[PDB]
A paper describes a structure:
Outer mitochondrial membrane (OMM) fusion is catalyzed by the dynamin-like GTPase called mitofusin (MFN). We generated a modified human MFN2 construct with deletions of residues 1–21 and 401–705 (MFN2IM). MFN2IM contains a G domain and a helical domain 1 (HD1). In this study, we address these issues by presenting crystal structures of truncated human MFN2 in different stages of the GTP turnover cycle. These structures explain how MFN2 uses a primate-only single amino acid variance and a tighter G interface, as compared with human MFN1, to allow for enduring GTPase (G) domain association even after GTP hydrolysis, a feature that is unique in the dynamin superfamily and ensures efficient membrane tethering.
We determined crystal structures of MFN2IM in the nucleotide-free and GDP-bound forms at 2.8 and 2.0 Å, respectively. Unlike MFN1, MFN2IM has a disordered switch I in the nucleotide-free state, and the Trp260 does not occupy the nucleotide-binding pocket. MFN2IM showed much higher affinity to GTPγS and GDP compared with MFN1IM, and could efficiently bind to GMPPNP. The stronger nucleotide association of MFN2IM may be partly explained by the aforementioned conformational variance to MFN1IM: the disordered switch I and outwardly oriented Trp260 leave an empty pocket that facilitates nucleotide docking. The cluster is apparently disfavored by the Thr129 exchange in MFN2, which endows the observed flexibility to switch I in the nucleotide-free state. Intriguingly, we observed calcium ions (Ca2+) associated with the HD1 of both nucleotide-free wild-type MFN2IM and MFN2IM(T111D), and one of them is involved in intermolecular contact. HD1 is connected to the G domain via the so-called hinge 2, namely Arg95 at the C-terminal end of α2H, and Lys357 between α5G and α3H. The four-helical-bundle HD1 is stabilized by a massive hydrophobic network. ɑ4H, which comprises large portion of the conventional HR2, is substantially involved in this network. The C-terminal tip of ɑ4H physically contacts the G domain. In our crystal structures, however, Met376 is surrounded by Phe56, Leu57, and Leu734 from the neighboring helices, and separated from Leu727.
Numbering used by the authors: 25 to 126, 129 to 148, 153 to 319, 328 to 400, 706 to 756
The structure:
């Protein structure tokens, strides 16, 4: 079975698809309206506000097309540098992607590219090897913790990237580090937050404050707790069993009671005990070619899965909700303009028919000349009712199509 990120990858494809259909619908509607308004052999059935309103809708819809086709999922990692925040990301990308061991104090952003080698962004600085990446960051005195650097990584290497996932590494938390600017400047668009901690120590207060600010400011943030450095339990399995259950009770109370972001039932799908160092080494080994190993190796793969389910579900609902509602209300406006035009063309066709009845009450010279002109005009109006009624009904299709999307991908879960 396939990665849960396909849920996001597909829904973006559909919502991108609907907006292409909607753009073509307005383009055609704008064409039909403006040419109807321009024909000066009919009493006005449309006004120039309607034509311009629709031309505005055409521009707006093309504007939303650009932003939608760029939507992506975002996961941010926080914590102390020593707890392995950086190896965790490396483990999920199956590579040493971020400088680790002994790291720079700024925000890092990992996104994929179709090109087959790597570069930096703050221009297009090269970074072929991880030692190269550490130095480009080392030389540049100008960067700082509030700056944002993007690692643009080949997505043929990592399927996470191909599926429109962005990974963001935050600077290592310390006791007086000012996290206060962090959420508004960088994490407002983030779908899941990962606290990478250490199993046997209690969370820093500064860690806790940052994740409470996220709880207050954001709309149901999805918070995972990663307890790293857990390979110590290879040699003291009996003790670490006692310690796991104690820390599991700590993190749950933090998540369920202190923060309120998950009730007790889901808490186990949000708190994990793993060793990213082990997972990293193993996956390095696998591409090229201790005790309790498989159990810890399986927990990381399970956490990876539980995270990809969460991010894909939540990201779709958050990046597309407003754009679906906008499309539905644009389709409604264009549908009423055609509806107004269909009824005005009808009301004028009635007028012309009486004037044809009246003409046949008058003189005989040029009767059929004169009744041809009126019969020509009546046919245009009748044909206008046709195309307008068609344009009305397909706006309902768009309405039916977008409502299907809300039902499938925007239900409150």
């Amino acid at each position: 079975n396939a990665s849960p990120l396909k849920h996001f990858v597909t829904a973006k494809k559909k919502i991108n698809g609907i907006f292409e259909q909607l753009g073509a619908y307005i383009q055609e509607s704008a064409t039909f309206l403006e040419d109807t308004y321009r024909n000066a052999e009919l009493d006005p059935v449309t006004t120039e506000e309607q034509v311009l309103d629709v031309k505005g809708y055409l521009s707006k819809v093309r504007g939303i097309s650009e932003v939608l086709a760029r939507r992506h999922m975002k996961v941010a990692f926080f914590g102390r540098t020593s707890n392995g925040k950086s190896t965790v990301i490396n483990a999920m990308l199956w590579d040493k992607v971020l400088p680790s061991g002994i790291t720079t104090n700024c925000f890092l952003r990992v996104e994929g590219t179709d090109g087959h080698e790597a570069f930096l962004l703050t221009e297009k600085r090269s970074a072929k090897t991880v030692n190269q990446l550490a130095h480009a960051l080392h030389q540049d005195k100008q960067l700082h913790a509030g700056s944002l650097v993007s690692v643009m990584w080949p997505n043929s290497k990592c399927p996470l990237l191909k599926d429109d996932l962005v990974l963001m590494d935050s600077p290592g938390i310390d006791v007086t580090t000012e996290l206060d600017s962090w959420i508004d400047k960088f994490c407002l668009d983030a779908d899941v937050f990962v606290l990478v901690a250490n199993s046997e120590s209690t969370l820093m207060q500064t860690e806790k404050h940052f994740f409470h600010k996220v709880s207050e400011r954001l709309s149901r943030p999805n918070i995972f707790i990663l307890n790293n450095r857990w390979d110590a339990s290879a040699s003291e399995p009996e003790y670490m069993e006692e310690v796991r259950r104690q820390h599991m009770e700590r993190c749950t109370s933090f998540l369920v009671d202190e923060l309120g972001v998950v009730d007790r039932s889901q808490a186990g799908d949000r708190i994990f005990f793993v060793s990213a160092k082990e997972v990293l080494n193993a996956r390095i080994q696998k591409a090229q070619g201790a005790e309790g190993f498989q159990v810890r190796m399986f927990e990381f793969q399970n956490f990876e899965r539980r995270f990809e389910e969460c991010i894909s579900q939540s990201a779709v609902k958050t990046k597309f909700e407003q754009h679906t509602v906008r499309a539905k209300q644009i389709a409604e406006a264009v549908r009423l303009i055609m509806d107004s035009l269909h009824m005005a063309a009808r009301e004028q066709q009635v007028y012309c028919e009486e004037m044809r009845e009246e003409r046949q009450d008058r003189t005989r010279e040029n009767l059929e000349q004169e009744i041809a002109a009126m019969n020509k005009k009546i046919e245009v109006l009748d044909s206008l009712q046709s195309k307008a009624k068609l344009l009305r009904n397909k706006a309902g299709w768009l309405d039916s199509e977008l409502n299907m999307f809300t039902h499938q991908y925007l239900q409150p879960s």
